[PDB]
Design a binder for this molecule. Structure first.
Ligand SMILES: *C/C=C1/C(=C/c2[nH]c(/C=C3[NH+]=C(/C=C4\NC(=O)C(C=C)=C4C)C(C)=C\3CCC(=O)O)c(CCC(=O)O)c2C)NC(=O)[C@H]1C
Ligand SMILES: *C/C=C1/C(=C/c2[nH]c(/C=C3[NH+]=C(/C=C4\NC(=O)C(C=C)=C4C)C(C)=C\3CCC(=O)O)c(CCC(=O)O)c2C)NC(=O)[C@H]1C
Lengths: 313, 315
């Protein structure tokens, strides 16, 4: 099973119970964005991140009464149609708001049962993706495909280290390709225990294909209330990229000297084949539109891995 | 019966009939569609060899001036990028794309690929979260039918085409429309089946490697290359990989007779085989700009993946 989260007086997480930390329900988010939850029917704002006032520019109480209808007039009917009752928690809808306080915000919404989860992040506003797609497809074998993928991602993102991280049948990990800035340790060829990414984290990565720690030293921002009014239970946040990252993992990142981290799941035959894994030495908020490019690349790599593995077997 | 290609018309080959169909060399027509321009150049020196006859009007230069310069001089910023992206021996399927600001012609999209020692350069005029939203909707579709319907509707919304169908090949190469989105008033092709010869075997081979072909105006005359043969080889210039390549007069006659002014289709490739087509029709001529066509190319790949996934959920 899982332990209760901390804020419901569950045990603190150690190396004896890695598998049981409830990473989906941390009750908090990373501070480079803001999150609101809301009722599926009424559009009634039920929870907000204590930092919402910053991003939205709204007097705190104003929000926690109001309706999405009021708050987002153009958007609220689109949401209603895009995310019908009963849809999967994996389905997401995005829009760009030109919002008074903040030039442009990206809005990302998904639905978990009766709750809409809304994420707001700063945003903005060429051929590198098309060029990359053809490059991946003409790679002659899996090894070269891995090399092209890591190089392409590094060029698109500027990340200090990009790795292709392949799982063995027992969930032992192996770095099979790597693109990195001069003057970093090489992780190419190295193998790591299964417990470095515990079973409960791997299952959630099979369904929700991208996550990130924008700053491995930033404090999480609580949800208020912490419990969902609807259920008097924790809000599931696994489908939210703003989710506060496990402290266990943040400690691992810090011990490696990483300041920003991000990964993309490569899913083949319904299973987690590997990850595109990105390190930055310093804090780094990759903007939403560039993340989208990596999300596309994730799908394309999933296709090409199967194609390429089929021409060996 | 499968038989080798006839020589093209310009090398004294025969004209094509419903009989000899499967032997038309559709990949070497010696000509392009008039909404863009094409140059060929030597892959090592960058000497310009062939150009479409309309090139002066896209590129704003006399032929003899174009042909008298190397790509190093014509494309000083792109020439080194081309050479890195398209190394000798690379496959003909690999494409490099850039946007140019050309004085006379505005923003041009440049698409380049390499066939042996030849570079092929295509120039076309070029111009929010719809793709991301579509990607997730496709993935959440519960079964093959719902996927097919979401895919057709999405493509129609992105493009404005009068008709978007999902055409699926059977094992005998006969095809069947299994989903479609269509303009009000058009008659339905849903569930109709068409014989295998409607897309003869050499087209289906070419459609497995080069994943998008189109016909922007079913009545437009083709524009010859000049000279027609590659001076490197005194042989035909391979245009299988060029979207500007002229369409077969057989298929163009087949389209006009249906009342179609514009045609476009994307291959859906599963396990190395052509599974089916995203085929689109417009009643009037219609040019879809290169950046919009890129969205369809990306959806072609997504759909190939999702078709595998939906079919595996099915035994
Ligand atoms: C109690 C168990 C511990 C544990 C937990 C844990 N680990 C993650 C997530 C990740 N761990 C990763 C491991 C590596 N990244 C690398 O670059 C290398 C090699 C150089 C390794 C071995 C990765 C890639 C992830 C995914 C997240 C990311 O992209 O950075 C979680 C879940 C994190 C979250 O979603 O909040 C958890 C709970 N880690 C340990 O080391 C043990 C002691
Ligand atoms: C002598 C042979 C004939 C022949 C040849 C032929 N057909 C194509 C290409 C296509 N034919 C298609 C057929 C259909 N389109 C539809 O909408 C329907 C049904 C509603 C059918 C049956 C399609 C979709 C294509 C692909 C191209 C496109 O989508 O526009 C070629 C190749 C053309 C080229 O690439 O230059 C050839 C040689 N077709 C016949 O009907 C016989 C008489």
């Amino acid at each position: 099973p899982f332990f209760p989260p901390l804020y419901l007086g569950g045990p603190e997480i150690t190396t004896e119970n890695c598998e049981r930390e409830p990473i989906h329900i941390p009750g908090s988010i990373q501070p480079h964005g803001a999150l609101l939850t809301a009722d599926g029917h009424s559009g009634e704002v039920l929870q907000m991140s204590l930092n919402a006032a910053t991003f939205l520019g709204q007097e705190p109480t104003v929000l926690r009464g109001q309706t999405l209808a009021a708050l987002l007039p153009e958007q609220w009917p689109a949401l209603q149609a895009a995310l019908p009752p009963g849809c999967p928690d994996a389905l997401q809808y995005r829009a760009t708001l030109d919002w008074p306080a903040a030039g442009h915000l990206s809005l990302t919404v998904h639905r978990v049962g009766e709750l809409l989860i809304l994420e707001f992040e700063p945003t903005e506003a060429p051929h590198a993706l098309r060029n990359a797609m053809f490059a991946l497809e003409s790679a002659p074998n899996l090894r070269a495909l891995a090399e092209v993928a890591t190089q392409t991602v590094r060029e698109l993102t500027g990340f200090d280290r990009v790795m292709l991280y392949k799982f063995a049948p027992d969930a032992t990990g192996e770095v099979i390709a790597e693109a990195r800035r001069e003057g970093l340790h090489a992780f190419l060829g190295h193998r790591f225990p299964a417990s470095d990414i515990p079973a409960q984290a791997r299952a959630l990565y099979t369904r929700h294909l991208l996550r990130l720690t924008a700053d491995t030293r930033a404090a999480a921002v609580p949800l208020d209330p912490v419990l969902n009014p609807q259920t008097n239970a924790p809000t599931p946040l696994g489908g939210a990229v703003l989710r506060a990252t496990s402290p266990m993992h943040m400690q691992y990142l810090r011990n490696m000297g990483v300041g920003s981290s991000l990964s993309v799941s490569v899913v083949v035959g319904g299973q987690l084949w590997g990850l595109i894994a990105c390190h930055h030495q310093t804090p780094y908020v990759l903007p939403p539109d560039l993340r989208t490019t990596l999300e596309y690349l994730g799908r394309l790599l999933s296709l090409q891995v199967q194609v390429k593995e089929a021409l060996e077997h």
